[PDB]
Amino acid sequence: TSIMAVTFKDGVILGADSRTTTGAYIANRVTDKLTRVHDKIWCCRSGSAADTQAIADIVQYHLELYTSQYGTPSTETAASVFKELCYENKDNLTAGIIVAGYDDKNKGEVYTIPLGGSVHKLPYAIAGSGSTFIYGYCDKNFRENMSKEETVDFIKHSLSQAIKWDGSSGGVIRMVVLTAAGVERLIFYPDEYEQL
Amino acid sequence: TTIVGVKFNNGVVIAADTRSTQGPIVADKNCAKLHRISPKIWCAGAGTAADTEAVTQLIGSNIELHSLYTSREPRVVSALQMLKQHLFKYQGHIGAYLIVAGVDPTGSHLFSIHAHGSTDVGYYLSLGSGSLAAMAVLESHWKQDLTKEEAIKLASDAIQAGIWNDLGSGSNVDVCVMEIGKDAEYLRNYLTPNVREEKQKSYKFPRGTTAVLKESIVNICD
Amino acid sequence: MDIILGIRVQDSVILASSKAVTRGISVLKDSDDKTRQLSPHTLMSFAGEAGDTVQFAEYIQANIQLYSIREDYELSPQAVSSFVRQELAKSIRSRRPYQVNVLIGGYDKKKNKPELYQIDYLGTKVELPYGAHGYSGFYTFSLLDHHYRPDMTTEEGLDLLKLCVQELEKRMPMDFKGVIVKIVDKDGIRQVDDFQAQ
Amino acid sequence: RALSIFSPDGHIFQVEYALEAVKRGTCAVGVKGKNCVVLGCERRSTLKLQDTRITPSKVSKIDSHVVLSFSGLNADSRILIEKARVEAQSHRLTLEDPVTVEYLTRYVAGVQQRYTQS
Amino acid sequence: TIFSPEGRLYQVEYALESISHAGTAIGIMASDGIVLAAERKVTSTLLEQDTSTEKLYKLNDKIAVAVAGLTADAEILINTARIHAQNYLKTYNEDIPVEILVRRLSDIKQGYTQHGGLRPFGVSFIYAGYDDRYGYQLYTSNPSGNYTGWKAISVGANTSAAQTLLQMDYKDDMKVDDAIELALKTLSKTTDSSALTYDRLEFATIRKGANDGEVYQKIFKPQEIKDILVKTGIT
Amino acid sequence: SDPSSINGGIVVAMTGKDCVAIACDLRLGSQSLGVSNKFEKIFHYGHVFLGITGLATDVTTLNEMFRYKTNLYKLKEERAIEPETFTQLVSSSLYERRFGPYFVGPVVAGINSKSGKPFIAGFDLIGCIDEAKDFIVSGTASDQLFGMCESLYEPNLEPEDLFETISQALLNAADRDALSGWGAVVYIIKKDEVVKRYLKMRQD
Amino acid sequence: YSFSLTTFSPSGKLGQIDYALTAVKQGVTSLGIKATNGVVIATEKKSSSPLAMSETLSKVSLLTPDIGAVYSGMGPDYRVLVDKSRKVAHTSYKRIYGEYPPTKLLVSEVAKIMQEATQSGGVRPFGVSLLIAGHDEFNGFSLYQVDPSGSYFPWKATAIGKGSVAAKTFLEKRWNDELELEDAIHIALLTLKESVEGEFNGDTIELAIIGDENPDLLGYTGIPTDKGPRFRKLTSQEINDRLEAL
Amino acid sequence: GYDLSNSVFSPDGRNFQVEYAVKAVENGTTSIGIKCNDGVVFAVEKLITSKLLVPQKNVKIQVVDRHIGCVYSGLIPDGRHLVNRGREEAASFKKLYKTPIPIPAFADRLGQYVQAHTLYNSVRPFGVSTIFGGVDKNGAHLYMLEPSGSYWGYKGAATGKGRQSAKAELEKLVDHHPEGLSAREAVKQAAKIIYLAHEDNKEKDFELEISWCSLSETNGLHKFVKGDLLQEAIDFAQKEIN
Amino acid sequence: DRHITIFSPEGRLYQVEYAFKATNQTNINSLAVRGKDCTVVISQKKVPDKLLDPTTVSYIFCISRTIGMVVNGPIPDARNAALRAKAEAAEFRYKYGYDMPCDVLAKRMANLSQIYTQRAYMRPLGVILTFVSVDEELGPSIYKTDPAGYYVGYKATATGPKQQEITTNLENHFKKSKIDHINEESWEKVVEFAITHMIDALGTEFSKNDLEVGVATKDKFFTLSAENIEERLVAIAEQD
Ligand SMILES: [Mg+2]
Ligand SMILES: [Mg+2]
Ligand SMILES: [Mg+2]
Ligand SMILES: [Mg+2]
Ligand SMILES: [Mg+2]
Ligand SMILES: [Mg+2]
Ligand SMILES: [Mg+2]
Ligand SMILES: [Mg+2]
């Protein structure tokens, strides 16, 4: 898995590869790793598929209840719910989650909840087995307040590298753009990203 | 075991081989691995046999009750959600691996479920020890917009790959076709390419061959 | 292993049980009675893990004695043995199983037949002309396969038993300090105290 | 819910009415000899055509050396006899001695008492 | 579950009162078998008599009961009784002695009399059974949880009337066929109805065939009641 | 260690023309030591036969349990349980102990009293149903039995012939198993009658 | 409130069970009639507003593919009893024997649910009587009444609620043991007309049968030992067809 | 006797037990809350029963989390019971969702809890009315909650013995200042309104307690009004009484 | 017999009957109509006290993304019912993987009401609940539940003290039009029809602050602000 969320000028973008493996067999080559927990709050999952799905479902349930009663939840609130589940169940969970969201007061925000259940607010985040190979690349090319077009390019290049070096990553690059304008789903095929 | 699911233009088909094994021994040469969750939602299982049948009957039973309670046809997403939540609760201990397919008022659906409670969606899937042989056929011949006929052929062919090349699969092909307009059609022993040849000899014994010590009538009645 | 033998002749069931109690390197006692009377016509011998053995025997005894008083009646040997089996079958899947093997000998007054049951700690029950628990069986079953007759008197049975005990004194590696022999017939339960010389 | 409570005069009405039920029961008597005790009871005359073989008799063995009889609600008596028999077996099991008659009485009496404040 | 100033149990007394309005059930014990006969309360042409079981229930292969009172209450108790029988069979590998079964059911009834503040069961039973200890046996239990053994007995309506009639004509050395006759005559004489017809009866025997050794329960099918009602001469 | 191997034993059942057969060995052992030569492993509840192999304590228990459950069934339903229904009851009863199972291999044989259809089935220790129409095999000599039956079997055998086949299958499979044999019993089951035969066999 | 609310009165009466039976008497008439090859259960849809849509409220319910029910008395009490009857069919029977319960046994379970509301602490009895009609392999067709006390009885034909005494009379005259299903449906429509005030058509009347297997209602083909439900609710138009040839 | 148990509806659909609970409130000391342009003000009357009561010491206004004030009239313990619950309810929220509880969220929490005590006959309704509020993500809010569990938002609120005077004075402010009211004005006015409403109970002396939660005057935290600000507000109420 | 939900000798449940009486204590009327592809609920909004914040006075609730609920009854019991419904709708989605239908939520809330009807220790809630949505299977939908645990589907309906006025008004419209919904394509027109027929039936004119409006369309249920309503009042004042 290679997953990332990047904040930019108008919001935030989530990207991921589409490969799921058991050992060296590719169980699914077109997985959707980008998961909606609310209209404009999404997460990328890594670790145990079972764990992360079950967690994602519970958060989605909590935030639907939240909306019924209290209105629109902040991205921080979403991250808090994820943390709670991951922390309190750290013994039986192998889950690493990146939470990304758009919100009118707060613009684009990114939180990462790595394996211990800790929370970290960041301008951008990378995770999954494929991420190790792009720490240098990402640290070098990321700037704050990038345009949409620039941001789409940064994720595309980053994940093509991660895909190139990690056998656990591959397939297509999916992205979700989160802005005041709405929700935009992107996809990029190998023949585009391999030749960068 | 080889099980496949293949989506087509107006529905979804599932197929399976018919071999049951206790280690290297073939126990049943023709069991049915295609099970009904509801009339238009079927599934095939691989892994612990008792588990897949049980998790199928439990959830089938709850789905009936849900349908009666809500006055609506069962949805495949409900079969999925229930199965995945149940399997998850047991942390892998219920060794059920399932391809679940069906038609409901929202359209047609194909899913895979793994024993720890994770799910996948797709247009074509396979599970079982015959998994890779069948997937090799699927990856070769699947296209978007298959007709009913093409999809049956494709799925049938994928099960054959498993039958011929996987020691874990054999005997016959069962198919079930779930088209959006219609009733679901279960096609038991749709293909039978593994007929036992006539034996060279007959082993029926001359009567009296067995030595008997003691004999008596058994009372059944009361 | 403690020695636990039973043989049913024509009109009685004979039980013999080793007298030794050994912990580690020392023989603590050479006169142990590995038996409890359950009812006037039913006797139970036992062998297995140290504390469990007596604890189980007395528990069963308490329960059968309770039944006798509640019903002013004596349960058949078949019923007592079914009851015992069930208790063992329960315990095998419990947190701490009873590790006890038992022989049950009884005289059924309603049928006028003697009866011998062998039940291991798993709740495996079988009814037999003769039986043993532990290593004893490895010698004694073949002896009795050879020497046993269904029509034997109580005294023939004791001679046959004498032969079993002689064999075990010869071939078995542990000193089990002889047996206590008990006969169960129509007149109840009696102890043969003359087995040191017959 | 409390059913047995104190009255203004200091009586526990439900216990007092329990005594009334005894008063209504068939008569039982016991006298002790110099080397024995005899227990005698009367048989009711509401309906007859009884099978005496099988009808629960009024004197009960609690153990091989101790008997119990009663007057009052027949059904109520069965509960006491059962607990008494169980306690007798349990006493043999833990003290390796059958109960004394005083011990057994103190036991039944305590069960009776317990039902007046629960 | 409380005492009256006379030392009586209100709710139990009132339950007994309820029972005296229920159809009469009669049990007679002969030397070679037992009879159970009962009158069905309130009938209609449209009632399905063939597939009906409101007063006579099989507890086990060797034990049956006749019911007087609330049918729904009785079904609760019958079911616990059927279970108790199988626990006993599983524990001891023997069919449960009749008294043991009766004593358990009575104890459950007694319980509702002493704790919980739930109403008692509005039910009285006649138990018909055989075992190898006491042979044929008849018992009775009522909402108090008291139980007694009898050579002949009745429950429900007109017990007093039926009790006197049975006392009159019962004789120890009776045979079952004679006891069948006795039970039907007694119901016939105590009915609050015009006449005693087959469609107002339940009937059952427990017989130990002489050319056998084991015991058979016969629950009379309506047709056979009609026949036996003619044989004994009540057409 | 392996509970399925401690005591020993085999059961086999076959179908024929308007009949079924079920057979078992008589051995009860404790590893190498043979303890009883009278341990039968076939039971019946009305007209439904059940053979059980495996840990002998569990064999006994499950017999007692299915007597219990079928007795109640008969009282409530006012008819004897049929083979198809019983198969289901065995299955769900086993699966109820999923994570602490009984160490047994049950085999069910009978004729449906309404349809007259011959019926057999088998289960694994947790209730998975093997529904095959020809033969079902179980126990420490299951491989041997599978071999014998696959070779010896033909459909639509007459009761008198089905008897020879099943007996031969059992005897020869037993003789290649150290933990089976010591005597054998065979049931020939028809709508109207059931015959029981004790076979003569090697006492080693 | 952990004590019984249904107690015995000095006369031996169980007050709340009587009072519940009174509630049933006030309810809209329903009936059931048993033929040789079927059973019909029927009732009136007494709608509470002409602004209400009467099909969104069924008084006739499937309990199992071969068992249906109808009631008289308090509707909401019926609704929950149906939910619990459906569940108990599964938890106490189908999950055990892999088939649906015979009619008598399911009725027996529903009766038990009602009986308990008659004895448990802090509850009132159910205010309904149900008629339950079904088929099963070994008992054939059957019809049962169940009362708030938990009693049940088998009927060849019966009626409950408002006009029950007159309707029981009209049935007692008209019933015989040679009735085909179509005839029983006829008799059911007639009997129901006497007790129905307003409009009498396929929109105000509710009929279901327990008849032949309906393979078109199964939902799938392929398995031939499975033939379809015997419970069928007649449509508005099927009802009207039988009224014009009245 | 339709008024022996709580969960009992009267034939007209009323709950007499709740109606009687209100009498306990009316019987209580007077308290008020005023919603200003960017905050809320709470004020209450403390009856000086005796010289022996220590001044400034029997605090009545209670804080919940850091941003909410609660004041009540009726049975004091009942109000404490309710604030304890409010505190658990606010912590549980913060624990899961990380943000401090919004005032309407908190309102309904108290609301649902109070209503629960009118569903069962083994319980009595609360014998208080509570005035509460604070600042959250989107403004100031003021609430009043009655023994039935009824609550609504307010521009101004009053309860207890002096309720009617206070409401009349409150109504005036709403008319004279449609634009808004500065947090310091609202404090001064609160001291006035409590002073005016005191006359309905003039036979005993009283001590005044004020607290506030303003975005600009307290950073959106609840703080007690103390020293200089309290004295200046008192002097205002004194001067404006004549 | 009059204090708890046990039967009276006439077979009645008095506490249930008294709970229906509570439903009118607020003296508010409400009505609901189905459009071609929407559903509209209107309720009167009365703000007697000048000290109240008008914005927090509401008897319309957003239960889920798709379901709205109007309540006729005192607010505390109303909010108790709203919370449960919200929770029940969230749970359904989680367990069964689709949005809870209007009718199913209704059946569920009715089932809970039945329980209060049967168990001695719970009092019924003094409220009538009207549920609206555009169901994905059934189209625009109105389902109403009461303290008896009764519920049904409606073509249109009305609730409150002056319930009958409005009912007969609509009853007459549907006698005329012969169909079972308002034959209009935009929800703005269906909201107008609804306000119009409330005016005729109740014989009152409404300002923007006297009304409260909820609209359910495919995949959203929402409520109108004062200003959305004002735009609706102006529009009606050009045929009328
Ligand atoms: Mg790669
Ligand atoms: Mg193969
Ligand atoms: Mg094997
Ligand atoms: Mg061998
Ligand atoms: Mg050998
Ligand atoms: Mg006011
Ligand atoms: Mg209450
Ligand atoms: Mg209630």
mmCIF file of C-alpha atoms in Angstrom, chain F residues 3-200:
data_model
loop_
_atom_site.group_PDB
_atom_site.id
_atom_site.type_symbol
_atom_site.label_atom_id
_atom_site.label_comp_id
_atom_site.label_asym_id
_atom_site.label_seq_id
_atom_site.Cartn_x
_atom_site.Cartn_y
_atom_site.Cartn_z
ATOM 1 C CA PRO F 3 -8.792 -37.848 20.543
ATOM 2 C CA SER F 4 -10.037 -39.436 17.308
ATOM 3 C CA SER F 5 -7.322 -42.110 17.666
ATOM 4 C CA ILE F 6 -7.427 -43.171 21.316
ATOM 5 C CA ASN F 7 -10.306 -45.671 21.394
ATOM 6 C CA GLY F 8 -10.519 -46.920 17.817
ATOM 7 C CA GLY F 9 -13.447 -47.930 15.558
ATOM 8 C CA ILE F 10 -15.176 -47.752 12.167
ATOM 9 C CA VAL F 11 -18.659 -47.259 10.810
ATOM 10 C CA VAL F 12 -19.850 -47.572 7.205
ATOM 11 C CA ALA F 13 -23.272 -47.177 5.604
ATOM 12 C CA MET F 14 -24.505 -48.004 2.081
ATOM 13 C CA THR F 15 -27.729 -47.692 0.066
ATOM 14 C CA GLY F 16 -29.345 -50.374 -2.145
ATOM 15 C CA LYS F 17 -32.649 -51.151 -3.892
ATOM 16 C CA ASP F 18 -35.253 -50.100 -1.335
ATOM 17 C CA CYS F 19 -32.835 -50.662 1.547
ATOM 18 C CA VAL F 20 -29.866 -49.257 3.440
ATOM 19 C CA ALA F 21 -27.128 -50.990 5.448
ATOM 20 C CA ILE F 22 -25.024 -49.756 8.343
ATOM 21 C CA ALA F 23 -22.078 -51.583 9.960
ATOM 22 C CA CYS F 24 -19.525 -51.055 12.719
ATOM 23 C CA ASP F 25 -16.705 -52.877 14.484
ATOM 24 C CA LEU F 26 -16.928 -53.821 18.120
ATOM 25 C CA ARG F 27 -13.540 -52.767 19.418
ATOM 26 C CA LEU F 28 -13.022 -50.430 22.307
ATOM 27 C CA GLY F 29 -9.394 -49.811 23.116
ATOM 28 C CA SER F 30 -7.033 -47.577 24.998
ATOM 29 C CA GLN F 31 -4.149 -47.123 22.550
ATOM 30 C CA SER F 32 -2.526 -50.562 22.139
ATOM 31 C CA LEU F 33 -4.672 -52.220 24.835
ATOM 32 C CA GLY F 34 -8.006 -53.693 23.725
ATOM 33 C CA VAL F 35 -10.477 -53.260 26.557
ATOM 34 C CA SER F 36 -13.880 -54.322 25.258
ATOM 35 C CA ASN F 37 -15.025 -56.489 22.387
ATOM 36 C CA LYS F 38 -18.699 -55.630 22.800
ATOM 37 C CA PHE F 39 -18.670 -51.856 22.159
ATOM 38 C CA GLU F 40 -21.363 -51.177 19.553
ATOM 39 C CA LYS F 41 -21.325 -47.873 17.722
ATOM 40 C CA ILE F 42 -24.692 -47.985 15.995
ATOM 41 C CA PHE F 43 -27.874 -46.704 17.641
ATOM 42 C CA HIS F 44 -31.409 -46.059 16.536
ATOM 43 C CA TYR F 45 -34.244 -43.730 17.301
ATOM 44 C CA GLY F 46 -37.392 -45.252 15.921
ATOM 45 C CA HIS F 47 -36.454 -46.111 12.324
ATOM 46 C CA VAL F 48 -33.420 -43.806 12.144
ATOM 47 C CA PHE F 49 -29.986 -45.339 12.668
ATOM 48 C CA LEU F 50 -26.922 -43.475 13.805
ATOM 49 C CA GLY F 51 -23.380 -44.871 13.884
ATOM 50 C CA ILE F 52 -20.701 -42.906 15.738
ATOM 51 C CA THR F 53 -16.910 -43.301 15.712
ATOM 52 C CA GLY F 54 -14.303 -41.340 17.639
ATOM 53 C CA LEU F 55 -13.679 -40.661 21.297
ATOM 54 C CA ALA F 56 -15.874 -43.284 23.053
ATOM 55 C CA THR F 57 -16.988 -40.957 25.821
ATOM 56 C CA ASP F 58 -18.369 -38.599 23.161
ATOM 57 C CA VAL F 59 -19.933 -41.506 21.334
ATOM 58 C CA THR F 60 -21.805 -42.407 24.497
ATOM 59 C CA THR F 61 -22.746 -38.796 25.263
ATOM 60 C CA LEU F 62 -24.106 -38.076 21.794
ATOM 61 C CA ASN F 63 -26.200 -41.219 21.829
ATOM 62 C CA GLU F 64 -27.726 -40.124 25.136
ATOM 63 C CA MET F 65 -28.246 -36.605 23.778
ATOM 64 C CA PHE F 66 -29.984 -37.737 20.563
ATOM 65 C CA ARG F 67 -32.204 -40.124 22.507
ATOM 66 C CA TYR F 68 -33.169 -37.096 24.622
ATOM 67 C CA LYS F 69 -33.774 -34.809 21.653
ATOM 68 C CA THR F 70 -35.671 -37.391 19.607
ATOM 69 C CA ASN F 71 -37.840 -38.430 22.552
ATOM 70 C CA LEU F 72 -38.970 -34.787 22.995
ATOM 71 C CA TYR F 73 -39.366 -34.388 19.246
ATOM 72 C CA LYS F 74 -41.746 -37.392 19.153
ATOM 73 C CA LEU F 75 -43.847 -36.069 22.035
ATOM 74 C CA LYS F 76 -44.292 -32.590 20.507
ATOM 75 C CA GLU F 77 -44.640 -33.674 16.897
ATOM 76 C CA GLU F 78 -46.541 -36.916 17.529
ATOM 77 C CA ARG F 79 -44.433 -38.767 14.954
ATOM 78 C CA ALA F 80 -41.009 -40.372 14.705
ATOM 79 C CA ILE F 81 -38.220 -38.155 13.372
ATOM 80 C CA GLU F 82 -37.278 -38.831 9.726
ATOM 81 C CA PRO F 83 -33.657 -39.370 8.493
ATOM 82 C CA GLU F 84 -33.452 -35.989 6.653
ATOM 83 C CA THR F 85 -34.586 -34.029 9.731
ATOM 84 C CA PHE F 86 -32.349 -36.000 12.042
ATOM 85 C CA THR F 87 -29.359 -35.297 9.819
ATOM 86 C CA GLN F 88 -30.123 -31.595 10.299
ATOM 87 C CA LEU F 89 -30.498 -32.009 14.051
ATOM 88 C CA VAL F 90 -27.129 -33.794 14.340
ATOM 89 C CA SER F 91 -25.472 -31.091 12.220
ATOM 90 C CA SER F 92 -26.749 -28.077 14.208
ATOM 91 C CA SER F 93 -26.100 -29.978 17.457
ATOM 92 C CA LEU F 94 -22.448 -30.464 16.498
ATOM 93 C CA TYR F 95 -21.943 -26.937 15.231
ATOM 94 C CA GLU F 96 -23.287 -25.622 18.527
ATOM 95 C CA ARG F 97 -19.992 -26.844 20.026
ATOM 96 C CA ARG F 98 -17.912 -25.202 17.274
ATOM 97 C CA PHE F 99 -15.034 -24.108 19.553
ATOM 98 C CA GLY F 100 -15.055 -27.162 21.849
ATOM 99 C CA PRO F 101 -16.309 -29.924 19.596
ATOM 100 C CA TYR F 102 -17.175 -33.532 20.280
ATOM 101 C CA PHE F 103 -14.450 -35.705 18.736
ATOM 102 C CA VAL F 104 -16.713 -37.927 16.638
ATOM 103 C CA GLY F 105 -17.626 -38.966 13.112
ATOM 104 C CA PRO F 106 -21.386 -39.612 12.906
ATOM 105 C CA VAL F 107 -23.131 -41.589 10.157
ATOM 106 C CA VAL F 108 -26.912 -41.583 9.616
ATOM 107 C CA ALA F 109 -28.863 -44.281 7.815
ATOM 108 C CA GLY F 110 -32.568 -44.845 7.281
ATOM 109 C CA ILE F 111 -35.598 -45.003 5.010
ATOM 110 C CA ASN F 112 -38.043 -42.077 4.890
ATOM 111 C CA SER F 113 -41.296 -43.623 6.110
ATOM 112 C CA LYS F 114 -43.421 -41.445 3.829
ATOM 113 C CA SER F 115 -41.500 -41.427 0.528
ATOM 114 C CA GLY F 116 -39.716 -44.799 0.944
ATOM 115 C CA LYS F 117 -36.476 -43.124 -0.238
ATOM 116 C CA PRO F 118 -33.241 -44.670 1.129
ATOM 117 C CA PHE F 119 -31.045 -42.156 2.902
ATOM 118 C CA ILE F 120 -27.522 -41.893 4.316
ATOM 119 C CA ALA F 121 -25.269 -39.054 5.466
ATOM 120 C CA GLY F 122 -22.020 -38.238 7.276
ATOM 121 C CA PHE F 123 -20.573 -35.358 9.301
ATOM 122 C CA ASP F 124 -17.267 -33.993 10.419
ATOM 123 C CA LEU F 125 -16.772 -33.314 14.123
ATOM 124 C CA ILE F 126 -18.364 -29.862 13.780
ATOM 125 C CA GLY F 127 -21.453 -30.747 11.764
ATOM 126 C CA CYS F 128 -20.576 -30.275 8.124
ATOM 127 C CA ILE F 129 -22.907 -32.607 6.180
ATOM 128 C CA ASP F 130 -21.514 -35.061 3.646
ATOM 129 C CA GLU F 131 -24.596 -36.008 1.705
ATOM 130 C CA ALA F 132 -23.651 -38.760 -0.683
ATOM 131 C CA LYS F 133 -26.076 -41.285 -2.054
ATOM 132 C CA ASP F 134 -23.837 -44.421 -2.265
ATOM 133 C CA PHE F 135 -21.712 -44.918 0.859
ATOM 134 C CA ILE F 136 -20.467 -42.974 3.881
ATOM 135 C CA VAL F 137 -17.428 -44.044 5.873
ATOM 136 C CA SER F 138 -15.950 -43.059 9.194
ATOM 137 C CA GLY F 139 -13.256 -43.850 11.722
ATOM 138 C CA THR F 140 -9.616 -44.817 12.082
ATOM 139 C CA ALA F 141 -9.771 -46.962 8.909
ATOM 140 C CA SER F 142 -11.609 -44.387 6.802
ATOM 141 C CA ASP F 143 -8.988 -44.567 3.994
ATOM 142 C CA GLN F 144 -9.252 -48.364 3.958
ATOM 143 C CA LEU F 145 -13.053 -48.068 3.911
ATOM 144 C CA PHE F 146 -13.025 -45.465 1.122
ATOM 145 C CA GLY F 147 -10.874 -47.850 -0.916
ATOM 146 C CA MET F 148 -12.954 -50.972 -0.302
ATOM 147 C CA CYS F 149 -16.266 -49.170 -0.954
ATOM 148 C CA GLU F 150 -15.155 -47.354 -4.107
ATOM 149 C CA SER F 151 -14.026 -50.718 -5.520
ATOM 150 C CA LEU F 152 -16.776 -52.995 -4.192
ATOM 151 C CA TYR F 153 -19.806 -50.747 -4.623
ATOM 152 C CA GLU F 154 -22.529 -50.791 -7.272
ATOM 153 C CA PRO F 155 -25.984 -49.138 -7.042
ATOM 154 C CA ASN F 156 -29.378 -50.942 -6.673
ATOM 155 C CA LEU F 157 -28.205 -53.966 -4.746
ATOM 156 C CA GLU F 158 -30.764 -56.362 -3.277
ATOM 157 C CA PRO F 159 -30.725 -56.500 0.572
ATOM 158 C CA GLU F 160 -29.129 -59.979 0.551
ATOM 159 C CA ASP F 161 -26.325 -58.796 -1.751
ATOM 160 C CA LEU F 162 -25.811 -55.353 -0.158
ATOM 161 C CA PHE F 163 -25.151 -57.353 3.001
ATOM 162 C CA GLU F 164 -22.178 -59.210 1.459
ATOM 163 C CA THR F 165 -20.680 -56.054 -0.077
ATOM 164 C CA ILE F 166 -20.828 -53.979 3.136
ATOM 165 C CA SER F 167 -19.536 -56.851 5.279
ATOM 166 C CA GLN F 168 -16.655 -57.464 2.916
ATOM 167 C CA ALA F 169 -15.834 -53.750 2.811
ATOM 168 C CA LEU F 170 -15.824 -53.570 6.594
ATOM 169 C CA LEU F 171 -13.843 -56.758 7.298
ATOM 170 C CA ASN F 172 -11.029 -56.058 4.864
ATOM 171 C CA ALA F 173 -10.739 -52.407 5.811
ATOM 172 C CA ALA F 174 -10.689 -53.327 9.523
ATOM 173 C CA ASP F 175 -7.985 -55.944 9.024
ATOM 174 C CA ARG F 176 -5.597 -53.255 7.767
ATOM 175 C CA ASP F 177 -6.204 -51.168 10.877
ATOM 176 C CA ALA F 178 -4.491 -51.896 14.176
ATOM 177 C CA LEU F 179 -7.201 -50.039 16.100
ATOM 178 C CA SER F 180 -10.306 -51.567 14.469
ATOM 179 C CA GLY F 181 -12.074 -54.933 14.376
ATOM 180 C CA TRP F 182 -12.489 -57.323 17.308
ATOM 181 C CA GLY F 183 -15.940 -58.267 16.020
ATOM 182 C CA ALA F 184 -18.447 -56.536 13.753
ATOM 183 C CA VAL F 185 -22.193 -55.899 13.518
ATOM 184 C CA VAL F 186 -24.240 -55.284 10.322
ATOM 185 C CA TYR F 187 -27.794 -53.908 10.023
ATOM 186 C CA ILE F 188 -29.905 -54.543 6.949
ATOM 187 C CA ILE F 189 -32.706 -51.998 6.901
ATOM 188 C CA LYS F 190 -35.918 -52.164 4.856
ATOM 189 C CA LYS F 191 -39.237 -50.244 5.160
ATOM 190 C CA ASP F 192 -40.846 -53.204 6.926
ATOM 191 C CA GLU F 193 -37.982 -55.009 8.740
ATOM 192 C CA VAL F 194 -34.481 -54.602 10.181
ATOM 193 C CA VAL F 195 -32.080 -57.554 10.509
ATOM 194 C CA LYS F 196 -28.930 -57.535 12.652
ATOM 195 C CA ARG F 197 -25.925 -59.840 12.050
ATOM 196 C CA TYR F 198 -22.739 -60.388 13.997
ATOM 197 C CA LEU F 199 -19.898 -61.248 11.642
ATOM 198 C CA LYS F 200 -17.133 -63.711 12.348
#
